């Protein structure tokens with residue numbers, strides 16, 4: 001029973017989704033003219049607010065709300081604490097539509113009570129290759145390939161309702177209002193991910209983490225010497241030795257990405273991303289925005305040899321508040337972003353990610369098993385966390401695919 005989700009253009013059961021073969025819209029076609037020109041009605045105590053992401057003060061207000069009310073793990077040990085600089089970066093990519101950032105404020109004190117954000121993305125979301133070949137040889141190649149062209153859609157992130165206001169059906173209203181604003185721009189699909197199961201994912205993957213500073217992680221999550229380490233007898237020096245890393249990168253030719261790398265990074269990224277069934281397409285501007293180093297936020301390194309970029313990796317920083325804890329207030333996590341290896345094995349490229357993260361003071365490296373992320377798990381000593389990231393489309397029928405067929409990283 002999904003009083004909201006059952007009225008929406010999404011597949012309704014794992015079953016409906018498992019019998020879909022071709023990509024395509026779910027709803028009847030609509031026009032911008034069809035869509036209400038006024039915001040969706042809310043209590044007169046509340047108001048719709050479009051924050052300004054160039055106002056440090058609006059960013060500050062979004063910041064505080066997410067800091068105190070955004071995503072926690074299942075056991076309430078950690079909550080995301082995206083920084084202000086991260087929010088500005090994430091919410092203002094090239095060609096973003098300010099209208100798509102939708103807030104609810106209390107009319108009285110102008111207190112921020114809820115938020116959802118949409119940003120543009122150019123996405124390949126045509127029928128997966130395997131289904132395309134099946135169709136091709138039943139004479140349905142054209143149907144199957146009808147929506148192969150990258151689409152300019154919306155990507156939804158940062159949905160958050162203040163804890164005081166939970167379970168009052170405010171999340172559906174935010175989603176309807178976001179949909180209306182997006183539809184008014186003549187966009188009919190969205191992509192989103194969530195830690196929870198909703199109707200109905202097209203892909204799902206586990207999270208994986210790698211300790212960089214085993215000392216602190218253990219004084220947090222256990223809060224003592226974990227299962228098998230306080231078991232054979234000597235922990236801590238054993239935990240440190242197990243997760244130790246070189247002090248400096250191993251691939252000579254590794255340096256920070258700089259503005260002139262933009263065209264080569266884009267080309268090697270695109271070549272790689274194009275082999276996945278679902279993935280983004282990035283202009284030079286978007287490569288610039290999402291990949292050029294930006295202090296405290298995103299960190300990007302290239303392997304350059306004979307003045308040519310042959311490989312790169314990136315990671316971004318999301319600290320999490322450590323919830324029930326006196327000692328350390330924050331876990332500093334690096335998240336694996338985009339990368340591409342052409343001259344070395346991926347585990348060897350990503351080992352340098354770990355070394356770099358570690359030397360810059362991160363506690364842990366996290367990721368989801370998308371892209372080719374599984375290929376380095378064991379070798380680099382990642383273990384599965386308790387999270388699962390589910391990928392979803394709005395108003396788009398899509399077959400079930402493995403997360404190794406997905407190349408869109410979500411922030």
Ligand SMILES: CCCCCCCCCCCCCC(=O)SCCNC(=O)CCNC(=O)[C@H](O)C(C)(C)COP(=O)(O)OP(=O)(O)OC[C@H]1O[C@@H](n2cnc3c(N)ncnc32)[C@H](O)[C@@H]1OP(=O)(O)O
Pocket residue numbers: 001002003004005006069070071072154156157158159160161162165166167168169170171172175178179182183187188189190192193194195196198394395
């Ligand atoms: C063309 C354009 C379309 C664009 C829009 C595309 C769709 C975008 C969809 C959003 C993509 C978001 C991507 C992310 O950011 S995922 C992260 C979401 N945020 C958090 O987890 C932060 C902490 N939690 C909260 O703030 C609240 O608990 C939220 C806001 C999550 C729910 O509020 P609340 O707890 O106070 O409950 P309610 O009484 O208002 O509402 C209950 C309804 O909400 C459904 N619910 C619960 N969680 C989620 C969830 N993560 N996505 C979608 N729906 C969710 C739920 O099944 C129920 O419906 P139904 O089963 O009765 O049917």
Ligand SMILES: CC(C)Cc1ccc2nn(C)cc2c1NS(=O)(=O)c1ccc(CCCCC2CCN(C)CC2)cc1
Pocket residue numbers: 071072073074078079080157158193194195196207208209221320331333364366384385386387388389410411
């Ligand atoms: C303690 C570390 C070993 C791992 C770790 C670190 C910081 C965390 N902070 N938090 C909050 C959860 C954390 C966690 N453990 S986990 O399994 O990797 C996981 C990671 C994320 C989630 C949250 C679900 C995903 C939420 C969606 C929201 C939308 N978005 C675009 C991406 C994530 C649960 C567990």
